[PDB]
Every structure is written in C-alpha cells, then in structure tokens.
Structure 1
Amino acid sequence: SINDSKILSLQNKKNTLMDTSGYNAEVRVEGNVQLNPIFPFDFKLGSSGDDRGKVIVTQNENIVYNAMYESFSISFWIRINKWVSNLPGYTIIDSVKNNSGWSIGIISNFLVFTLKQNENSEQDINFSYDISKNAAGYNKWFFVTITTNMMGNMMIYINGKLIDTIKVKELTGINFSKTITFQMNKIPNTGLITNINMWIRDFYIFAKELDDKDINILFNSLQYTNVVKDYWGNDLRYDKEYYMINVNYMNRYMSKKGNGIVFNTRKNNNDFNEGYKIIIKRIRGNTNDTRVRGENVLYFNTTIDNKQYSLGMYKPSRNLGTDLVPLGALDQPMDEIRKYGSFIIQPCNTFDYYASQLFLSSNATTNRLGILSIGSYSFKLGDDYWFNHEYLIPVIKIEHYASLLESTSTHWVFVPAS
C-alpha cells in the first residue's frame, strides 16, 4: 500500500547490494564491506581505518527533486556493536553535498537525524537510549523510522514507538543531495574516549510521511515474529552457548549450589560474561533449521565443571510455597528431562528487549503445566546445614499463573557467549 511511495529500497540480493525500488539508484560498494549470506542479509561496516567499508547510493535527481522538499520517510534496521554511552561522534549515513542535505550520526547514547540547510544552520531530532537499561551498551538490532514533512513536523520512531517530534523551521536554501554514503566517519573533537561496527538491513525511503500505523505494519512485516531472538536481536539457535538472564535481574548471573541454580550479583557491566552458560536443545517443533521458534518444545543443558547437567525441577529442603517448584541443575537421563525439564517457548519482544517466556511442558508435549519465573526463597542447598538462606532462584509456578503471564519476571533473555 505504502510501497507505491517507496523511491529507494537498498537490499542485498544474490550477494549484491542494489536498489530494488524500480528507480534503479546506483549502488557502489568500496572497501571492507561484508554481506551476510543468510537472513537478515545485512551488510557490515566498521570504523576500521584504511579501507573502512563504504556504500554509495546515487539516486535519480528528479526522483529526489519531486519528493524530498515536501514529505519523506527513512526507515531501516541497524545494529551498532559496542555503542557505549561515552562513544565519540560518528556520521554513519550521510546525504550532505555542499554543506546542505540530511545526515544521520551517533554520539554518546544519541542517534541523531539532522536537516542541514547550510554550513551555518541546521535542525535535528534524536533518540537517546536508556543508559541504565543498557549498561553493557545498546548493541541490539533496532528499527529506525524518520518521518519528515517540510511544512510540518520532523519525527523519529524506534521499533515503531514515537520518540521525538518537532516542527520543521524555515530552512530556505536547503538543497537535498541525490547521494547517500554509508560509512563510519569519526567527527573530530567529540570526546574521543576509546573500533566499532555497524550492520544495516533494508534501508528504505518513501515519498510520503508515514503515520504510526504504516510504520508499525512495516516494522512487523520485516520480521519473522515466530523466530525467537537472542538479546542482540539475532535469531536464537539450538546447540549454542548463551547466558540466560531474567529481565528483572540483569545484574545477576547463573551459578549452582547443590542441586539448585542460584543467581549471584555480577562483578560489573562491561560484559555479560560471568557464570555458567546454557545450551538449548530441541525436542519438538515444526521447522528444523537450528533456529528456536515459538511453540517448540526444548530443554537446557549446562556445563559446570567438566560435567554436564540439564535444568529440571527438584524437591527443595522445605516447601517454598503453594504451586511453586524450584528449577535446578540435574545430571539426569532423557526420560527424566521429558517429565521435569522440558519447556515450550514463546517469543516475547518489547521496546526494551528481545525475550521469551518459558512454560513447563507436560511430558515433552505442547501442553502447558506452568510458567518459569524467578524469586528469592529461604531454604537449604548444598552444604547448608544449621540455617536456611535466601537464594534468588529460577522457579516454576504450576497450575495458577494467570497473573504472572503479564509479569516481566517471566521474561527470559539469552546473550550469546560467542
């Protein structure tokens, strides 16, 4: 429906970056530019140095001429790795020729879109990520949508959510360029406090001002909503090490005491690399392509010392509560896993994160018996003898969990150990 207004569609087809809108913009790729052979078929650039990648798109002057001066929208998927809060300034997508046009850059925790009328004046709008919720850096895939009405407002959306909006000021003289250059270029004197990478996927430009509904329909249509994602937004996969974390306790890592899995406070936030890792193993599912999907039935393995355990329910020293059963690490055969450690996964994405919900499976079928949550309980594990101790543990609420169905305490994330 809105495709009728699409004037640029930068995509990777047949291992070749090209415009598929129909207006045949010219695409030139120079330097260190890597193309992903599998979905999402993104192209990767780096702040590298010598031959840092560079993608140049030159469109039709007339097409630009009869669109950019009224209403237009820019949309694309992007990922920046190690987008730390004190990152210096970088221009990443530039369309400024003679000190006029538009540009997209980053500085600190900000992503900013600039309308540049001349070397002396400009107007910009921005998105600043929540530092407290992204201590290890905002290194996840996110969907950008910038809408501009030269006689109205300039608005920026992130993952379909309106972030900022401002009335476009008088910018007479602004001359839009028909060239767009994708390249990570450092901006001098922007607080150089150190090499970063950037991934771009499906860069589109529409000759209209996309509204909220349009934006979100676009957002969703570019995703395979039943494929669960890891913390950075990549497809979640079986047979791969991940750090399993609960959205409510990002500063906790997985440890073990006796039969129980317990969560400890991590040392710092420069990484998520602390504690034991889990490996997801498939039991049941429609497609069988290594990717973890919605209604799949699966289980979790983990290597502690030089032995491997599977996550499974166990009997605590004392009852923890009505309909509550702790989840631990057990060296058990498959028949036991099917009864006490099999889960049905469901993707659960929000503006803030890519996550999932895990439901206890009934004998490895798609029939649900409970939901996986987390909480602190006082009991005894391992060598505990004289007293009970509070342990933050993964716990399953059996039959009655309607209220938990909406709790973020049931949202689990997976950070690739890589």
Structure 2
Amino acid sequence: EDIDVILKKSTILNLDINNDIISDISGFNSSVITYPDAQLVPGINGKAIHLVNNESSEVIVHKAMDIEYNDMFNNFTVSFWLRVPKVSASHLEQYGTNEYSIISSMKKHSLSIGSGWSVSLKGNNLIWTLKDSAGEVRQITFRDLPDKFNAYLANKWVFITITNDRLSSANLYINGVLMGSAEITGLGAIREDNNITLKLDRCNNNNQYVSIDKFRIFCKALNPKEIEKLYTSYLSITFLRDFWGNPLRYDTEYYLIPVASSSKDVQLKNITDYMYLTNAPSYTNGKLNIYYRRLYNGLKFIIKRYTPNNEIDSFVKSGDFIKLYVSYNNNEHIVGYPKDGNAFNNLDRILRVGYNAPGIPLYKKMEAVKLRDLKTYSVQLKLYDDKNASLGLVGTHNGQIGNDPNRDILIASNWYFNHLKDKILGCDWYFVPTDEGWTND
C-alpha cells in the first residue's frame, strides 16, 4: 500500500507539543498528564519533552480504552527522537552499571512483575525489554560506539524505532538503521499497566537527564521501508540545525567543523587574513573504552541577519541572508572576500576575517542553506558579491599562501554546485554550540 497511509493508519498514539501542551494526536485521544518538572526544549520540529532526575519530572499517558495493542501476541512499534548527553568518563565508571528506565508500560510498585515493555539506559547502552505476565523476558541491548563524536547516545537528537513482530523478532533501529534484534516468538499475554510512563526511574545519577520527542506507537511491526520513511519525514528542511540536531540560531557562538574532515578545527592566521584547518586534540580512555575528538577549540563564529527582515526572531531558516563573524579578542570580525582578493586559480576565493583595506570592496552577503545530506545536521554557506553573483559555497582548498606551511584554507567556490550528489563533499559544515550535554573529560 501507500507507506504514508500505512504509517498514518497504524498510529495508535502520537504525542505532539502545541502551545506548550503535550497531547495525543493519533485520534484515540489517550489522556496526557504532564507533571510540574517535565520541561520543554527545542525538538526535531517544534518543542520536545525534557526529563530531569526528580519525582516531579514525568509525563504519564493514560492509554485510551481502544488501545491495548499488546494483546495476546499483538504487534506494535515504538518510535521517538532521543537525546541523551555524553556520559562523562567519571559518571561512566560511577553509574555505568546503573540501569534506569526512561519510558515504560510496566507498573513497578503494586504488582504485575515487569508488566509489559520499557526503554532503559545503562552507561552507554540502550535497552529494550519485553516481559509477559508469565515471567518470560526478552531484550535487545544496544552498545553505543566508542567514538563519541559519532555515537548515538552522546548529545545528538537521534531517531529510535523498535518494532515488535510477535510471530518472529523485535528489532531496534536508530536513524532508520537496524542495530539490534531479539527473538520474541512464544511469549504469553503481555498484561502491562494502563499507563505509559515517561520518567527516569531508578537512576542514581542526580545530574542525569534525557530528551524525548514525537513519542509514537503503531499497531504493527514497521518494516525497513516504512521505518526509513517515518525517519526522514521528520527532517524539515525549513530551519537549519546545529551539531546536536537543535534549530540553528542567530547571535549564538558556534565552533565550525567540516563534515568531510571531522577531526579538524578552524583557526585564524591573522586578523584581516585567512582561516585554515587544524587537527583537534583528542581524548582517549582505554579502560572505559571511550574516545572522541575534543570540542570547543578553534574559532567561535556568529551568525547575524544581513538585514533584520520582517521578524525579530532568533531561528535561522534555509535561504536567510546572513553575515558571518568570528570572535577573536572579544571583538567580532566580519567574514568575507575582498574584491580581487587573492584566490586559488581565480576559482577558490580565499576568505578573510576582519579585512579592512581602504577602497576595497569586501563581499560578505551570505546565504545559509541546506542543499544536501538531509540526514546530517550540517549546513552550507553561499557567498555573493554586491551584484547578486554567486562567489561560491564556503569550503576548503589545500594550498600554500606566501611562504606559510601547506594548509587547508577556507575558500568560497562554485565548484561545489557540481558535486552535491557526493557522499562526502567539503562545503558541509557542522555548527557546534557549547552544550552542558557535552564537556570534554
């Protein structure tokens, strides 16, 4: 059939956030009780649920009387956007074995041993548990990647999809990719609690917090194609996104990292001069089997509206014309390309920071766009002159300026426009803002 129709008709619960209110929009109108400390934060498309570690931080969904899908052997799928901060080395050793659930249909503290199902976290493990009324439990334990820059439980919004085919297996996917599975054939009736609880339960780390968005449940075990569609469907090209998957913002400091060479940071030669790539320092921990390129080194960039048009908003949308500045010595210097400014083969125009030569035009009108790699939280920057001509997309060129060492220098080139289909390009940028969800060990 139509994947879109199937996806829609199979939805039996779909939490949305409108006007700061969390409710079910599936149609069965499952009642939603939002406790005092359930906070709201930027989500994948609108706002999202943010949970902290205290009794008042929870959201309870009272399943409608028409929704009891976990019937004798009946299939269901759970999907949602998840964001958990990078567990620090100390906390990993500290609370690494502390399994705490974050979403459950189980009713602990009364009876019905382990009720139905749950989504729990243990150190850097994402766990799915299914338990029937006769004891029987099944699980999928996902062990995240060592490299936290590319891990899934390390401060980036990620799409979780767990399908349950009671006639075969249960499968866990992340951003549409299968990453764990378990047989679940032969389970008895799952008699869970009438409430689905969104809450950090049994977590000993008082500082722990997670973020959940678009929590949804389907009455069928989604297949790879439907999952793949559900996933990409949430990616609205409208607003741009920063490294963590949050909406990109104006007048906010961002460190830039080129997707095509993620181990690199951006440095400035001298004010009025060019920028270039640098190897970022690393953090490695063999005992905890954790490692990642550190963040927050290099130049701080700041996006500003070229001309404060129609609205005093702070969200950057694709197509917005902007001005780029780098903060060096507390002062903000504009980023651009001077007329007839030095360039590599008159193609790759070398960018400059704080260029201020008298009588020389400095082209700095830029457009923030999203022209490719929909799944990656990356942005492209298009530079124009003053006569609406494209001076190219911001990227890098590996050359030598004067007698300086051979470097990967930031430039503006139109060559990019003829390779937008490539996997890895060079004009793709990560905008990294300092976040409490990630501090270098």
Under a length normalisation based on structure 1, what TM-score does the superposition of the two structures give? 0.82
Structure 1 residue ranges without an equivalent (≥5): 381-386
Q: Determine if contact 1:344/1:360 at 8 Å carries over to the other structure.
A: no
Q: Which residue of 2 aligns with 1:124?
A: 139
TM-aligned CA distance change 1:133 to 1:389, over 3 Å: same
Aligned 1:260-339 pairs, distance under 5 A: 260-268=274-282, 272-283=295-306, 288=311, 289-313=313-337, 320=344, 323-332=347-356, 339=363
TM-aligned CA distance change 1:378 to 1:331, over 3 Å: closer
- Correspondence for 2:428 among 400, 411, 418: 411
Q: Determine if contact 2:263/2:279 at 8 Å carries over to the other structure.
A: yes
Aligned to 1:42, the other structure's residue is in SS state strand
1:253 aligns with 2:265: yes
TM-aligned CA distance change 1:70 to 1:284, over 3 Å: farther
- In 1, Cα distance between equivalents of 2:387 and 2:370: 15
Q: Which amino acid aligns with 1:110?
A: N
TM-aligned CA distance change 1:100 to 1:67, over 3 Å: closer
Q: Determine if contact 1:285/1:297 at 8 Å carries over to the other structure.
A: no
- In 1, Cα distance between equivalents of 2:232 and 2:359: 39
TM-aligned CA distance change 1:368 to 1:109, over 3 Å: farther
- Correspondence for 2:401 among 357, 374, 379: 379
Q: Determine if contact 1:235/1:291 at 8 Å carries over to the other structure.
A: yes
- In 2, Cα distance between equivalents of 1:225 and 1:68: 41
- In 2, Cα distance between equivalents of 1:334 and 1:405: 41
- Correspondence for 1:82 among 68, 80, 86: 86
- Deviation per residue, 1:298-335 (Å, 9 max, x gap): 23112211432112236999875573232221244999
Larger CA deviation: 285-294 vs 23-32: 285-294
TM-aligned CA distance change 1:37 to 1:130, over 3 Å: closer
Q: Which residue of 1 aligns with 2:286?
A: none
TM-aligned CA distance change 1:221 to 1:404, over 3 Å: closer
TM-aligned CA distance change 1:68 to 1:111, over 3 Å: farther
Larger CA deviation: 72-81 vs 166-175: 166-175
Q: Which amino acid aligns with 2:103?
A: I
1:71 aligns with 2:95: no
Q: Which amino acid aligns with 1:411?
A: D
- Correspondence for 1:55 among 29, 54, 59: 59
TM-aligned CA distance change 1:165 to 1:287, over 3 Å: farther
Shift of residue 290, structure 1, vs aligned partner: 3.1
Q: Determine if contact 2:72/2:188 at 8 Å carries over to the other structure.
A: no
TM-aligned CA distance change 1:130 to 1:321, over 3 Å: farther
- Correspondence for 2:217 among 192, 197, 205: 205
Q: Which amino acid aligns with 2:101?
A: T
TM-aligned CA distance change 1:220 to 1:337, over 3 Å: farther
Q: Which residue of 1 aligns with 2:51?
A: 45
TM-aligned CA distance change 1:319 to 1:336, over 3 Å: closer
Aligned to 1:53, the other structure's residue is in SS state coil
Q: Determine if contact 2:42/2:247 at 8 Å carries over to the other structure.
A: no
TM-aligned CA distance change 1:256 to 1:209, over 3 Å: same
Shift of residue 119, structure 1, vs aligned partner: 8.5
Shift of residue 278, structure 1, vs aligned partner: 0.8
Aligned to 1:274, the other structure's residue is in SS state coil
- In 1, Cα distance between equivalents of 2:16 and 2:180: 27
- In 2, Cα distance between equivalents of 1:225 and 1:203: 21
1:225 aligns with 2:237: yes
Shift of residue 399, structure 1, vs aligned partner: 4.9
TM-aligned CA distance change 1:83 to 1:3, over 3 Å: farther
Q: Which residue of 1 aligns with 2:438?
A: none
- Correspondence for 1:149 among 162, 165, 169: 165
Shift of residue 355, structure 1, vs aligned partner: 0.3
Q: Which amino acid aligns with 1:181?
A: T
Aligned to 1:217, the other structure's residue is in SS state helix
TM-aligned CA distance change 1:363 to 1:112, over 3 Å: farther
Aligned to 1:104, the other structure's residue is in SS state strand
Identical columns (%): 27
Q: Determine if contact 1:344/1:368 at 8 Å carries over to the other structure.
A: no
Q: Which residue of 2 aligns with 1:361?
A: 384
- In 2, Cα distance between equivalents of 1:127 and 1:297: 42
More strand by share: 1
- In 2, Cα distance between equivalents of 1:320 and 1:331: 18
Q: Determine if contact 2:338/2:361 at 8 Å carries over to the other structure.
A: no
Q: Which amino acid aligns with 2:243?
A: Y
Q: Which residue of 1 aligns with 2:102?
A: 92
- Correspondence for 1:6 among 11, 21, 38: 11
TM-aligned CA distance change 1:396 to 1:129, over 3 Å: farther
Q: Which amino acid aligns with 2:199?
A: Q
TM-aligned CA distance change 1:173 to 1:143, over 3 Å: same
Shift of residue 163, structure 1, vs aligned partner: 3.0
Aligned to 1:235, the other structure's residue is in SS state coil
Q: Which amino acid aligns with 2:197?
A: T
TM-aligned CA distance change 1:320 to 1:53, over 3 Å: same
TM-aligned CA distance change 1:173 to 1:221, over 3 Å: closer
**Aligned residues: CA RMSD:** 3.6
Shift of residue 359, structure 1, vs aligned partner: 3.0
Q: Determine if contact 1:253/1:275 at 8 Å carries over to the other structure.
A: yes
- In 1, Cα distance between equivalents of 2:357 and 2:239: 28
